[PDB]
Amino acid sequence: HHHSSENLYFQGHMASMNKEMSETLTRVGPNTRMGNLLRRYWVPALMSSEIAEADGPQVRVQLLGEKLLAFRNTDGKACLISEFCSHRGVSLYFGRNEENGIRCAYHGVKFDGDGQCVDVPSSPQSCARMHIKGYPCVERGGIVWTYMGPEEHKPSPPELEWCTLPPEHVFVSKRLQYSNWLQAMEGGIDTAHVSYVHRFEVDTDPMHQGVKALDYIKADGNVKFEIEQTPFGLSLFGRRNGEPDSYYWRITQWLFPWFTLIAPFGNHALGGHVWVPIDDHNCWAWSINWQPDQPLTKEERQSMEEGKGIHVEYEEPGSFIPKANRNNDYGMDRVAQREERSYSGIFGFSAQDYSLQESMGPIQDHAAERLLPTDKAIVMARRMLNEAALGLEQGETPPALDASEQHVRPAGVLLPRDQDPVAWAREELADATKKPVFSL
Amino acid sequence: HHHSSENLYFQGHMASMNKEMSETLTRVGPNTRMGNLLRRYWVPALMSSEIAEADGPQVRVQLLGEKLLAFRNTDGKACLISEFCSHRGVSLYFGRNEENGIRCAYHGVKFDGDGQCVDVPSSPQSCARMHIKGYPCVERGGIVWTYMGPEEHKPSPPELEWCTLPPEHVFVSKRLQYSNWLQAMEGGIDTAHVSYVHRFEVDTDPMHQGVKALDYIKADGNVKFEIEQTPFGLSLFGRRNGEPDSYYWRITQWLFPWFTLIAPFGNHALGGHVWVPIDDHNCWAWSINWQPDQPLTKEERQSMEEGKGIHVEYEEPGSFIPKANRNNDYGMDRVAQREERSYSGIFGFSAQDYSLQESMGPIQDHAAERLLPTDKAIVMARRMLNEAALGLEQGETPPALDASEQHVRPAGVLLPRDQDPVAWAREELADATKKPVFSL
Amino acid sequence: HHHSSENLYFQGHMASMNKEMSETLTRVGPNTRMGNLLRRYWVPALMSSEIAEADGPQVRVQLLGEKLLAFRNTDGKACLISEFCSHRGVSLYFGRNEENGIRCAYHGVKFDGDGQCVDVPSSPQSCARMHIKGYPCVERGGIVWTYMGPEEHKPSPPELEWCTLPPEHVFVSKRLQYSNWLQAMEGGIDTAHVSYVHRFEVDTDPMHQGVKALDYIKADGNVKFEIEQTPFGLSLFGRRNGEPDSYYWRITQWLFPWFTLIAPFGNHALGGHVWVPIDDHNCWAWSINWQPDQPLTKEERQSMEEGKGIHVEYEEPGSFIPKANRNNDYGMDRVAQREERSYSGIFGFSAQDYSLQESMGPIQDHAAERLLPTDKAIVMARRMLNEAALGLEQGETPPALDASEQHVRPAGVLLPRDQDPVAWAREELADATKKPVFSL
């Protein structure tokens, strides 16, 4: 136990974060508690498509405070190294990807994919003092993943369902988000939000519309939660009223430290997020859709490419800033707000969510938060993160390192009000990726 | 007395501000000395026209360091609350103005105009812990005023002449100014400025031109001052040479803490300012024109709408940034400067003044100021402000709280050089809003 | 000796800067060690052409941390004063250049070219307390130079070759550079760079192309250095392989504290730089071309005006920001990079160099530099600067104050591998501006 560990409840409501814990969770740079924790997991760096071909243009990428450079060498292996030449500090973005390496444009020093210095023109014997940081990589889901932690503790690469399926079952997008990773992830472990800001989007949008779940979601925002701790993270049982006999359970899966699997809408593709910290004020927000049984159709895949569903349209090509952003007021339409075609005045799943999270300021004011029951999932995920971060300081091994425990699924069920859903899911969600999808 | 109180004179010239006093007067945020002083007066928040209709789009407004949200409820009452949901800190700009309240777009918590939480979906019993800051409001002059101080010390709403007249006698505009409130207000208690930067504007401009005062103003920048302290603030007797027998007295009224009434030009409408701090580096600069006797004509009102006189044209619609600003060099025309159609090279009353005040940097370098005689009004207003601010710390009641003492007028008179103007004004400016305007 | 003085070598490689020395050299503002050192030399402020005519528009100029104003008075003398009115701190950019002075636009105070206050309307006796900083000036090379140091130590104005020649032998340009003066100057005392980033530019460009030096430069980046200390700065003997019998020596001249003369390419005009600190994060980079024997032709002069050679094309007219800059990715063409028409992917001498130096961040990370042999000149210039800066603190007189020692030239020679170049240059580079140019 460490003083920082906040109590779960205070005066009979859930308790907010104390100052130190606020910091433990938000500060992600090198040699921070959370910086060190996050380094132990495989990290999604960028998409394979951004560095498609060998000897192709390198791209700058910033993760967990460090500034890096991604490129694909001559053999075709995706590599990731530090952005800066060890010589006089110039950027290797201006260098030359060729002959299995990056060669600095200033004086010709060359580094390979592991950041080993392999040529120094003026001084061949200096190689060993010119090494820079290079990080191992693997490709899965159409994403380049990197391992940024101590060499001896590198785990098995992740085996989430969208990472194991064949390519054309899967579709991935990413968006830059002008806020700290925490508040953003917090948004996808809060199913009560869907009943308010998304109330009217849920009907027009092709990845969501025309399924029976919507009648129940629309008609009750008041979500009671049950939370079960597991080898991979948490399972979130979000209860709403079904019929008068019954309850609509949405079960979303939180896979520590930064993944969700969202409970389905009908036979529409399954959805998921990742959030990756760029610094303490920004993050990559990843969105994944995938179908377990058939390929994605063309009307599915194309709808995603146009930026419907949990995806977005971009400001300019290869921008990764959304079309709706803090410069155009996120497209606010007050007229639409009055006529009840949009709750917030903003259009689009993604925008409706990040508009609000950006508006909190880069880091949410944790001091001024006053929590409610709908925040049960959030509070527990915070504890798991804090206790892992603090535990790693003290030499404990962090949770969820074992990829085989990540073969799981979200779900929806209608159930009588006396049936216990945790028991139900013991029965039904064992070996869940072999069964079809539990849906409504 | 407090060490901060600077002496009025040093080595036979007027004395500049010491470091602490510099700070006492410029730092306007919550729980500062000047923050607390200013909170005791009614504060001009925004114009009624910006939130014209009920259930209409709320607007963000920042005053005295705090970030707020203004809107007009269903009954039609202008309200002003804190910008941020008490729940998880999201902006209420994205919420819903309806049924006498703002409802947060994220999870549906609703606040009324006094910032009382009136609905919590997930937890009806939590209402009392979810309150936010809400501030009483009143409408006068076409302006929404708010009272931001302790509840028990709220005074009578202000009774300045342009606040009591009927609407069509009055016209109000506001402009965003990229500098601290102090240096800006200081500019409208410095009538010597008019003889230099405005020398050539005073003739072309329809709210100023073709009156006899101009010959005397143009022909003498060297203004001797007499200052009389009063219940409402200060009276500023600015002396210039008239004929060889006489003196042209411009009497401007400074109404503590942040108002002026400017001495008239002819029968042209009367003019006035307010300056309101947004933060320590910016302020709203308000300009008011009004006619006591008749309505404003259409050529008057329209000229003001086009941005002549003490008003401005805007960069874009509903911007409140001026057409001439720090990005276009305030429109500088050096050719016009050489040909003596503009002193500074810049066109427009307002621009000619704020161009210079913005150029001092956000906060004037008080350490490096070397004062002259034309700065007599400035020095005294500084003392009144410092002594009120410091006195409030020590439990003294601040000046000018009583609205009835604000029924006053500015004036111009030609007078023989032996006649004392203070005596003159005892006689003539008693009950001044009942008489016509003393002018030239 | 002062602890700061770093050792020249560590573990058999050249040693990087310690923390304090890093600071000694980069911090250039008033009352810093390096601020004080640099003040003792004549400083290039701006070009004569920017303030061509008398009573012409003044221009803002920022040097060595101070913010100034340059203008040409009625007599025609270039003057330089502090930007700000001593009265209430307004900018004199808005004032009036006429009758041998600048008159403030606010209240009419006037200053002459030495910063003496010569008129105060409200108070003639106040003149002596209203003085501001004014700095003596002289014109040479088409540049206004100013002397910003104590009055009693003003030296003779500089007698560099391009300062003494007649106007039409000479051409000067300047560019704003988004980095500290040091790393930029460091770039022009590093001839090994030319073999890499400039490899392909050296052939297409009319101030460089079609001369025999290129074959030798292209074919060896591995530059051995010999450095000889002199009255004016350092002489840099950069050795590359010539034929198998011989060595191509490029001798560049570093004239303390911030000038270079670059070793020639053929009969193409001679080239030189200056770097002048604006603040700790930016600098003016000056480029000079000149021909000693004939005028510059029209195809020479015009090519320079179009921004070829060590000059640049600008973003907009009178901008001084380059066409290629940090906003357009410096024009990167990866296709050209692959097809070996550009090493870095960037086009243009100047851009190829400053792209890399800007990319280090405003101040190079001196802690993380790992030096190589090609950095011999850099290391020594750093010592000369540190020891002068530290010595001035202790009352020692700084080096290179004597203009007559600046009548020198750069050179290239092919030489047998047994001939010593320093001896060669004793013989040949005595009285070098009287001889023709040693070239290849």
Ligand code: FES
């Ligand atoms: S900075 Fe990269 S090789 Fe010199």
Ligand code: FES
């Ligand atoms: S943040 Fe406003 S109700 Fe949740």
Ligand code: FES
């Ligand atoms: S500020 Fe320059 S004269 Fe008043």
Ligand SMILES: [Fe+2]
């Ligand atoms: Fe959502």
Ligand SMILES: [Fe+2]
């Ligand atoms: Fe004015």
Ligand SMILES: [Fe+2]
């Ligand atoms: Fe170069």
